[model samples]
Target chain A: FTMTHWFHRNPLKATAPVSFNYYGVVTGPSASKICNDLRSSRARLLELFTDLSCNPEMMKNAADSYFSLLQGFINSLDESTQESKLRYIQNFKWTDTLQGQVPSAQQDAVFELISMGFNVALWYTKYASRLAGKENITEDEAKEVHRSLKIAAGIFKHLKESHLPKLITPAEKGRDLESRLIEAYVIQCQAEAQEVTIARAIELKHAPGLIAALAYETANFYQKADHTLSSLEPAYSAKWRKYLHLKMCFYTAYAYCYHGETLLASDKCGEAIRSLQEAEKLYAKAEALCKEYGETKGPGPTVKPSGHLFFRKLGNLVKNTLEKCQRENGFIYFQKIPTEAPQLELKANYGLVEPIPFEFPPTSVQWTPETLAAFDEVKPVKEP
Target chain B: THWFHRNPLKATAPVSFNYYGVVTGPSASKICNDLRSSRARLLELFTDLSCNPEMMKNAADSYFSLLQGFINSLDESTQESKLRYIQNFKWTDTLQGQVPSAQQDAVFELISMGFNVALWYTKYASRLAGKENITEDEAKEVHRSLKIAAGIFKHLKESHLPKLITPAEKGRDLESRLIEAYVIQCQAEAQEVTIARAIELKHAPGLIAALAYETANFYQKADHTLSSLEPAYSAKWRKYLHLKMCFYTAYAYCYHGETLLASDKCGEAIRSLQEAEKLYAKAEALCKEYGETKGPGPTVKPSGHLFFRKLGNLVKNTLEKCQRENGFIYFQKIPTEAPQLELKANYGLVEPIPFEFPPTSVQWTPETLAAFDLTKEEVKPVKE
Candidate 1:
């Protein structure tokens, strides 16, 4: 891997594909699968609802299908296998000197995207719970997400126990995933788990390679979010407000993880995880709110994807996945969570969603009586 | 005979060659009965506001300020005042009626001058029916079947359509395009078309043919701008142009989300909408500069319908997203096919000073408020 010492932002192009070649959103290769599926869904909607007299249901359904297609781009990234991660990083130069400033250019769309990160993670956790014994997710990849976590944990163990003395870099670079996990994450979360009086002896950890990549992801999140407010407007107040706080916490963790490389950086894990969790709650609220846009009553409606959904989900997935593998997927690897401790939904604690109001500006009008009548005239007017 | 056999009236007959029989009314405060005022009987039921100073000013001011500005944006061919000379174009078309199905989203576009007129004309129509202009009962009369026709036309939904024989389908292409146009209906598929480069799309030509000729057939010649043609059995090119303009105007309204005549930000909304209105202006200016002149509105295909959507969606989405994300708008080159791509706005709908009310919008007036009926339910997508 082309390793430049200092951390940098992502200078991603539009077609660069969401980080991790997320299902080739830019390439749009398999995206046609979604498009084709959309056509089928549309036909179903049309067949299901014969009334052409009705509105926008057909259109909204169509829009929803496509909207999810965009979301699928993110899913692609999250679904990357462990080997894919290793290969991607092995060959992938995080950023070169020529790569200007990375992707830190703050934008509304970006924050929305970042916010999605957290929600996706929460979605994974919630969705997995929903499938506890039921169908086990018809989508195989979704099911594999759970499997990836255990694989990650095992890999972190391997890294901490066996690969600790391997890396060329001395300071934090040599830290194995599990030892670091136990030293930093486990101890930090142990107090909270004990305080709750529910779970105990909860050890936390990560993998070295994964930890490094995470460091980069965390850094990228910070840089992008630095100037993301004001532009997103009333859409920002709730989910984003909480999400930003989570990001701030992530920054704190990032600082401790990066700086305390030699001394076992355990102090910042709890605060960091807490912030990320709160952010996920925001998207949880969003899913609750947009559900109201439809006929569904009891928060069955998901939030229309917005800035908060994007960023929160982005953060959630990255961090939680890291914990699931016990930090095996990053620069540092955690071997195992403490036998007495546990990671549960309550640990992530994505609360119920909420509905919120917002203002949208205006654009233009289309038809008029004059034109409608004119369209019916028998003879066209003469021109000069 | 009337009013003491037409009391002494001072009138000046036009001495100019263009005005052979034209006469001027008396300026002095005299009891004159040389009244052409009552000469307008059927129009008098229309309130014949020709003489009322405030009414005239309102019409003239609106005619100049609102209508003229509206007219100012249109091209010349669209300005021909002959009956039913408005085009009915399809800015977007999709069988599935979904986002990706759109050639490109007609969302985030600049105003199309075509749609701007409807906003102005529709609002003015409502204004004409208002308490100050027409008595409440009189206003209610205009709201009878005519307004019913308007409601059907606005949403263009099947319910809005009470009856239609399909006009015998003599012109199969026209009938089919009508079907296709109806299928896409108010939902526009972005064709990468903009007012600055108004494409002479096939639908536009067909729309023009129907707008000018169809209405001419219905009205029977009292409104023909090109009535001087030799043995006219079919619509002329002039009629085609005029129809195109009207259709474009109506199309602009729908594409830009101008749901009703009096939505929020009516003044600014209507005005900004007529970006392509200049096409009408240019055509009018050109015609006035040359050609067989007639007293009519601007005639070019309005630009606002196309551009307003592009610009509206971009700027509005950008501003809203940025505000929430706490971001900035340095330079978003929106053309890139990526979520993070900065929205490239045309700066068409300029930022009007944010007024609290009244001047900002006519939302508060009883006349306007009474006519302004919009509910989230009304806007709810009813398709399926």
Candidate 2:
């Protein structure tokens, strides 16, 4: 439910035009008509967004509709410039501002549509999680929640590997969205996708080893997301700074917490306790920041008083996680794993080091039922 | 010859290699090296703009009006001579090549390369001024390099701009870095000798006046370049530019504004300084916010009372005349006899607000000027 609200905004007709101020820089007879049509469609979308969140089923339908509509609009352009005297109107007025280079309208449309698709899929994942979180849900409804989560997982898996086409080159110099923002959004999608994959594994009663592996895999995604967030510092602090900071902290806490839970599931009590203690420290810092700054809002107002209520829930999750770790490892689990001083004597073989031997993991266990079945064949290895 | 007008051969001749000593950090050395290379590249690239009509015409139409006219001024023989000199002028062979550590020396070498050639036609045309053997062809060639250097400086500023935007957007804590890039260029212009050299040139009075006016116009044009940047993204940098524009305005005052008044062009001088005052006040407000408004600008009174004293007289008349009619506010409050306005270039980085020191002093600060986030990551130089 919290994830579904990630992109919550009170959409407006006024805000839509603000993003497209550079649009008026477009000209010519076709540009005029197309530009006007764009406004109408944009207006229609804004209107739809106003009532969108309340209706549970509206997310996918809206995504499909907008995707096809934009796609259709792009096809209609149809190199009509050649069909309608392209020679005279070589560029839009804004193209001159862009170092006199223009990327095609198709490129801009598709990139934006793809971004919106990510948004739609993430929202669906959140909705599914919220359904599963509730006390009352029939077996069919529980199945439906997993079904949506799997769909989101598939969408995100595809998106993470999707290379944005060089639709707009550096030479084109179009008024492009900042790359950091795009990367940050992509990180969010992947992290959420990994979270759901973990849920699906637990729901299916996967073997303890497989479940631990899945948890560890999810932690890896969070670590990547954290790394990405730390690297990306948007120019304006008001724009994406707080949000980035929140994400950086949030992911760090999640990675440790998830790692701890998985290690415990795998019966690695000592490592699990250590990881849980680290998780607690990070969660405290993250919680403090949340209380101070509220939620991450890009280029918008500081989060409201009730903004970071999500952190309160997360705090409890960490506290409960620590208690679980403590119960398994005894009172001493609260203490840090101390490090001993290194022995001073140099190694005889220090001058020439050999490379560590490494073996790559086999093909995806997440896919191919046979891979899961092979793990199942090693039946009595370790029970949860 | 005096070091002020040292010939390229004498300038480039071996000095103590120790003068080009090691920098404290690898990145500092890299910055110094790159600065030299970038300037050299810019000098090398001058011929493209100077000789070609398309490149000249293709620059900002209104902004490059003077550059275009200068390009048109060259006849076939003059253009060829210029192109040849531009091809031949090896900037790396000079003292700038000798001292990698000193940015000022590198800047001087560049300015002199242009000015030394341009000087022969002017009154400050020392050294080779009275040489009867200097032919019309030689003078024309030197003049071309000067004109081309001016155009290249303008080109380099814009080129450097788009580069700075990327780092700034990427959140590199590039506030000071961008300011330094801007100042390095302005430092070359700020030299009083350069101003004196231009004013003394044996060109048409109107043309000389226009040349002076061009200096003023360049700053305004550079100010407008930031308009393309996002307002939020550019907010702090905008303050830095306002501070920059203020200093340049003072340069305009001494170089163009006061000179205009001395020539009895009271109207133009009034308009220029009036603009300067607003810029100064805005800069003052910004500096005041951080409690670092430690400026009236750089060097207030230097050697030679002739240049300093006479300018005050010119400044007084402009303020007296303009304030009576224009209802001038900022400058009107001060006595014109001892001009409170400092006439220095004030070119350098605005140091970032330090978060380590808690406010022990009884100095009040504004929100915008204060360090917004203390936990922001330190800048780490990337491998080239």
Candidate 3:
């Protein structure tokens, strides 16, 4: 529980692997269960980062203690699952504190991991910078974000295009269960990945196409994710359900921002305004999530989680994007149009005209045949 | 567009989301278009998945990404995109319970299959309670369908309902649209309540109370919307409106009583619930003579569909065991509190500004009136 609390305090690193002790005696089912547990913990960590927007020193101690446990788990892993185990080790959530350091932070360690085909590790490094914004991120770090995005996008793209397709050999020509599940999830992962892709593009001030791509990828991912969540016989635990909702919402809002920005950049004024409007709406939902369930208290003076830091930045981005979109829509930039003193005032006064108090005279008698007939009849009645 | 012409802020409370730029025209059209297009691709992807899993997955991934781009456009959409999407929606079988069993089986197949077809089916399902005399299998299927659909629609329903008010203020019949959305939401909740009822152990009370509270709240909003119109409309249909007035008042009290019942305020709850039943009966009597209300315009012609039977049955269900012997039941008072957690945020705020002379939304030109032969002759003065 203490370890869990520590993870909550520093969520950015929560994606790091769990120790063997965290889940004793790893086997097939046990490993799967362990992975699921890690996934659950990862969500809470991410939630904390988004919620509190900050962290503590105790996180490093906790992460390291767990790190040793993961090492022991790694020793027992089959070669088939070795790569997955390495995911935790190489992608250890590095903290600002010295003890939180992982070998992946070392220059050679980074290159060796990527060359060894652990691209997610490299992706995590770049993603970390994007999340942590307080310290001026190195110029290389920015490129790393973009590069990591490309790598993730490549994996996402290639998984369907090249690797996953080969499962359709004559013996395995049909989409079996695992393949179907993969088909369902890969796109959703792409959506989450594309958020950073857009953020990186935004960071790099890429072409309008980049924003367009970002919008496209982000939304697609969201819907696919939606499909899985609503799939037949879905058994998503409540934790994952909340996480997915938040995940889609956040991606959706940012995607919209980029979508609108790109539209504006491309000179599609009408569509751009609409994009911003949608973005703002999503932002409102996202903001509510952050404020209502998220930690509303301000971050501490020194230590802050990069995940939380990024959210604040993202929120500000949404705000600005919303304003920018509205500004583009037809609006009165200048509200102070001079009244001009009623420019030629009309007067109600009819200059000193005395009221004419006169009564109408009796009608001049007559020439109408009807009037004559009526008069004759009336004279007889009056006499009576 | 023009600050001077903006609609007056009606609610004197903080909103939970940003209201500005939510009603753009282009955005709505785009959203409708996107939903349509994505829907098309979804059909194709689902079709191809058997043989072309790899191809379909790739295609769906790209398509979904594109679809996401269109979602946020609603925030900035005016009447064009948003309105078109909803209005263009072929609501042929929107009422799920009313559809034929063959169609129901088809819908059920789509939902149980491994796709997002559940959400589309739910557009109908969310607002419908299943009809009677279904087999156990069918009942289970329907329940599963709602469960999946609710997970997705719940968010959309919440987001979409608040949005209609702005358009109404901009000039359409606010109550009509508000009621439309409310009915859908109410139906979804009611379905949940019914589902809970079927099971021995379930979230019946919470579900029922939520449904009642929101229904009551929505009715009050509907009443407010009705009142916001020209007084002439109300004055012209005094007797007709009394039916709705009583129904809304009774609906609120009945639900409030149920909520009170949840707190074991049984005696008070019973009195209020019975009082609600009485008012509802009165409303039914008023409406029974006239199949529906008659008013001056198309907007006011009441085609209101009331489930009087449902409410009546619920009253009976609750009151069956509540008649106490030899005692007057005095209930404890529940204290009402104002909205707390108000902070400076973009989305939620409540403030009222009284304005004079709301802009005329429609006008009958003199020439047009003449063309319609609506002119009346001047009357001669009476002789004193």
Candidate 4:
């Protein structure tokens, strides 16, 4: 599991402190209590992001609690007025994932929600990866890993479709909130979830054809995900692209190998030979890319793909099955080797992975009409 | 470019240095010792040569030189009174069976040892080809080794096989069909190097396609030759040849597609690429099958290599471009059939290097010949 569990991550954003005080008007104990709650919850979540060993459930609750309060504060603001009330409440400074620490600052609560939500999604991915890397992962752990990835995919998808467009300032290219970047994360997580299903199918010794179809779909997911990043500058995106690209190749190989197995079972020895041939070729390409991935300067744990059992297993399977097919054909079938490789199953009927649906948490109850009335609106200032 | 798969070297048993009461000279023991030591050294080097061309050349030369002394002495035309059936040699056939075939004729020794050297050259080519980022010089050496191997096989088939007192059994290495297969395979592989160079040098797509088509033909011919042999013995080799045939066929179609696109034949180019994709897929399957097939050569992951992966991407990208162009501009009707590849290449066809035996060793002089007495018959055979 450790061999295949290495995950890539974008750095978390750092933010400046915020207080509920608006021109000293919203200065009561209740406002102060709400301010302290927001500070403590955001700090807790940020602290948890640094520790992969922290309970994911606890982290999720922390995220939910902070998001509720932030949402409540935003809901309480009067956006319809000519003068926005919360525009100058606090300056939020958060770093972009790809762009180094010259943070993008805004007084918008929506930007803070988007940035913090992105971090929470990333944390889920890291947590899944950490669980997957356990030496002897249990069935329950595997299920959790799969679930976590799905949840991560959903969060990214939600943020991309909903929160990103609400920003007053457009996201820069290569930043974490960019549409393409978020889409890549979403697709990658879904693909990784499918990978977990593939492992389960393999462990259960499911039909080769089914496994092949799933792997093929997984490869397509990785490929599409990689394509999303292709337009980004290679200087910043190359390592991540390589990871996605190699996984695409590796899963394609896996698909062909299992497809070959399925063919051999049906006595299509000639075509089966061709299928396995494609698989072996693809697997080798994957192996080469694995080396490149490890050697390339990247912000991820480097795993030895060649030394992994998952890699060796498929390699050995391809070899053994191809041999069997040839032996059978040579000894008894005497089938003509085909000019074209057999077509793979186009769609998988079972075990297809999907992102879990994500929704924003409900507004916190701390924002009463009285509290909203107590906060004063900032006067509109003309630009210099 | 780990496209080449190698089979293990043919095994051999120790040779008995018995003269059967034939003429013996003062230098007789020294000549026998030389042969014994040379064979030992060659076999030892064979196990661990590690692609060092110098070591391979020295080992092959040492054994060939010493063996030639015995071969020349037994030549009926050159030395009419010399006995040919003096020493008994045993060699395990590369294909078919594990049991050794013992022959007292000196020509048997020549045939077996020559086959080993040829096999070694093929192995050397494979070893170099399997490496990453192989130097231009190393690539040239790979091509050279394969050409030499082909030549050696051709020589053994034409020159020495006719002189064998015992005809080669079916599926044995000495069988003419098997030798022909090896020759064609080596030549085909050598041509593959030529194609790679062509691509590197950015040669015309049409020319490269033609060359690839011809290379595929060579592999097809080699595979065909093995088709009639025992499947149990030839299956793996046949798979290798067949996969290469399919791979180059794909290469041909891909480049042909490019050539078509350059000529604005977008629809035809799309069809050609579609075919290429199919063939490439089939070839990949076969590559996997080839690795799994039980065989004498080393198992390698070929599809993962840059050489194999490069063409796949080329086909995909070119196909996409062709379709896009056709849809936006041409609006041409889709072709129902794939465009046929040219049967012959106008340039870059490969041929084997010619092989010739070195002159007889100077150790077999008249003085040395005279030192042995033919009159004294010995009942016991000497083991070296």
lDDT of 2: 0.37
- Summarize candidate 2's per-residue lDDT along B158-266 as a digit string, tens digits: 3333332122232111223332333322322323223434445643323333433343444445446555544443444344444434444444553455455445444
Give per-model TM-scores: 0.19, 0.30, 0.24, 0.48
Chain B superposition TM-score per model: 0.20, 0.28, 0.35, 0.91
DockQ for the candidates, in order? 0.00, 0.00, 0.00, 0.01
What lDDT score goes with residue B217 in model 1? 29
Name the DockQ score for candidate 3. 0.00
User: What is the per-residue lDDT of model 1 for residues B101-219, given as tens digits with 9 covering 90 to 100?
Assistant: 11111110001111221122223333343333455444333333223223222332232122222221221111232222212211111111112223233334223322322322222
- By summed lDDT, the worst window of 10 consecutive residues in model 1 chain A runs over A1-10
Between prediction 3 and prediction 4, which has the larger lDDT?
4
Looking at model 4, residue A105 earns an lDDT score of 73
Which RMSD does model 4 reach against the true structure? 23.9
In model 1, the runs with Cα more than 4 Å from the true position are A1-384, B1-37, B40-384
| Candidate 4 per-residue C-alpha lDDT over A1-384 given as tens digits, one digit per residue, 9 for 90 to 100 | 322444555555555655544546666767666777888887777777776557768887899889887875455444454433554466677776666556677778887888889888887887887788888876567777888999999999999997788777888778886899999999999998888778766765667887898999999999999999988997778878888888898889889888877877887778888888888888888788877877776445435554466667767877887898889889987888887766766588667777999988877778655565666621111111
lDDT of 4 by residue, B30-139 (tens): 77778788887777666675537678777777777767765576444565325356677777776644566778787888888888888888888887888887998999
The iRMS of the candidates, in order, is: 18.6, 34.1, 35.5, 18.8
lDDT of 1 by residue, A35-95 (tens): 3553464334323222333233343344345334333321223344321112112111111
Over B1-384, each residue of candidate 3 has an lDDT whose tens digit, in order, gives 000000111111111111124423444434434544644555544323242333533444444443333222333433322211211111111112122121112122111121233233332232223344555554444444445433333333334334432222212212344233323333333333342343234334434444434433433444454454444334223334445455545644555565555555656666766777787788678655434433332221222343446556667766543432101111234233311111221211111111111121122222221222112111111110
Model 1 earns a TM-score of 0.19
